[model samples]
Target: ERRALKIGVNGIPVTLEPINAISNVGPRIVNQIFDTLVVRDFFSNGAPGNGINLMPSLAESWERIDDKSVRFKLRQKVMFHDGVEMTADDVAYTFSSERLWGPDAIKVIPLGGSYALDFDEPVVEDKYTVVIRTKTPTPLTESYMASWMGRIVPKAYYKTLGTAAFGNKPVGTGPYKFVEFVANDRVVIEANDAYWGLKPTASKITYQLVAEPATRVAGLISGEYDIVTTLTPDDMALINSYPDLETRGNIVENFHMFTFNMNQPVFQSKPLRRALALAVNRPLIVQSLWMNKATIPNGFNFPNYGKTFDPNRRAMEYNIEEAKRLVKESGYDGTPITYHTMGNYYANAVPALMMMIEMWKQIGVTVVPKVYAPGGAPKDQDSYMRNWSNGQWMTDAWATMICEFGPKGQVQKRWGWKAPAEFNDLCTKVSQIPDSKERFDAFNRLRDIFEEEAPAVILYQPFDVYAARKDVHWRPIS
Candidate 1:
């Protein structure tokens, strides 16, 4: 008999709709139950035959016919999980609608990411052939497909059932088939015997929603679970106590920030915002609260984006005197600025927020901390601790800006802030340019505005930690 697979996670989906808004927990389940046309091959170690290191899953081969259009030749005889034969119609219909490929579609934004295809209607050339044409010469078509926005669903299945029913019952041509999803509890899936690619090692996968780190660690120690993700840094020693269990982590492309309400009376002043930014001792927080498990971010772009990262733009430094001077210049009247956040959302959430409150008080400014449940904070909270994970497919800094900080950016909308006209224009120009140097310069200009506005106080990047029993052969990807 094959080994059964079980895993524990920190979040569960609000809904199972693959193309709609979802939480971080949703993607972990989505990846297994659905198949994308292309995927990044992390095992290749950056080599050719890689689709630039992207492995093909459903579409066997593709080619760029022109600047604005690319053609895909679908794999023959592919079958959906429900045993329906997949063809170009499913591929075309999946993308043809405004729900996904339209100019204003918010397909995957709620997942801390966004993709603008800038497309009209996709054309199905034949039974197994689909052609995608963009309004502009979109360079990142394949990359977008590899990201969360590209998960192809069966057109007939989705339309027939609709999003409501589809969430309860989803069908796709991936390695795993969806079994059941009990909201906030656990999602169960089984390996698809008719999988078109290599079969998953674990025949049955259960993602148990273990919101508490101690409970997840305890489950691993007691052998109730085989794998768990988002482990706390302090809990490493406990896991190390068991010789049969091991822990691993990598620097994920994500950063935590103190998102401010620009419209709030307390934060409306730029000088006040700058003062608040300088008040936090980032290095100290990273070392003490994070257990030295995070990297201090200089600005918007992380170091991994290669040439796109601008080293010149740095995060505000900690200086009580400077912060006090700026606060005095702003004519602050000692109002109790509120900081709202969830107590258990992140590993260092509560501790970090409390530390920031103390740090702000050092600058002679009043800060009121308010803790709420995940996604339950009031709109008027002067500031909140927010985070976003740039997907592995990111190549340019523009992608990060548009997805997180631009006009339709996920964080920008949640914060009730819009990227100024100048910012939007710059982002549009950056997306159109194909040259790396030109795009890098544009990204630098865009980030300059981010510094000037200071809508959010940029914090540090942390390593995503994971743990599992020795018997399971699963590995976590960044």
Candidate 2:
């Protein structure tokens, strides 16, 4: 008998929105149990966008015939935990269901007349092979497939559970299996003995939620949990005090930025955006607030491995005089900018937002920080999205990586600000270039464009701070 491992997860599985264009929390739970078509090994450093090449969990092998057409071979022996073998029918059904049931699948795939991806040619041959033909010559098919939206599920199982019920009990061919769930408290998953890929060494994983920063850190110190994610800078310092605890700083694959509603009168002008970007002192923020652990991203994308990072790209710098002049010219005339955020999203979001608000005040821009009370994040996300989608001022990141690679990334843009035609064009082009060097160049261009035009003012990419028992043998992927 396999030894059952007991992992203490942070909290309950409230919403599995990781599969949709919804909440981030849900995806965190889903990530543990569902294997994507491709995923970066936890230790890979040269990963682009924090993800490595397509490591097939479901696919046996996939090759591109050309830019537009690619063929994938399925692992014939692979089976869902419930005893369903992976087949082409499941592949076809998955695409169709995602179109009908997956949040933003249609938007991400693009309309027949709107975007360039050729959706009509997804053909299932036999029971173990599938082929995709795109409208354009594209090398990014596999890279695109590396994300959560590309996670394969058993179609027959969903038929039994139906759409609404399926989410409650997700079934997939992954390293872990769902065991039980309790709302807002914890989620339990067990190692899948029948897993096709590397099975987790741990037998059971339970995510225990502690919304308050202090409680989460306290739990870590008291041996209540194995790992603590998204720790505050102060807590990170405190973690070092524990002799048995080992702390690691990681480059969060997540993005962080201050967003401006272009439709809003106060922020419509480019000068105003520039002023806002120039006002906040990133170095000061990192040194004082972040304790100089995190990297202040030069642009939208923070290169995980320093080797691939383009240092030539300049980050928005603090210039009080320049900010004042730009805001004055843009007609701000000391108008207060309202910034909305939630405490649970970031480590010190409340204080961070307040600090930014104070920095903006120096340039004669009155900024108001409105934070939502912490609780059921799904409901809070819904209400916030309803208001935010309609165009509200928010201090967050542009989420370019999330836009392209996260579980909800494909549909997330539609949920919030619709990607401008120019941005959409870039995404289209980047998807086509087959060569790695060329693809890297294309991303460089995208970053340059974002930097030149501050659609999102990046503060800094936060680090994934984790405290573990020192004896535990593990190193974090940078």
Which candidate leads in lDDT? 1
lDDT tens digits, residue span 113-201, model 2: 22213344478877888886666664446754555556666778876665456666778777777777666666677878788877566
Highest TM-score scorer: 1
TM-score of 2: 0.78
Q: List per-prediction Cα lDDT, in the order shown.
A: 0.72, 0.58
Estimate candidate 1's alpha-carbon lDDT, on a 0 to 1 scale: 0.72
RMSD of 2: 5.9
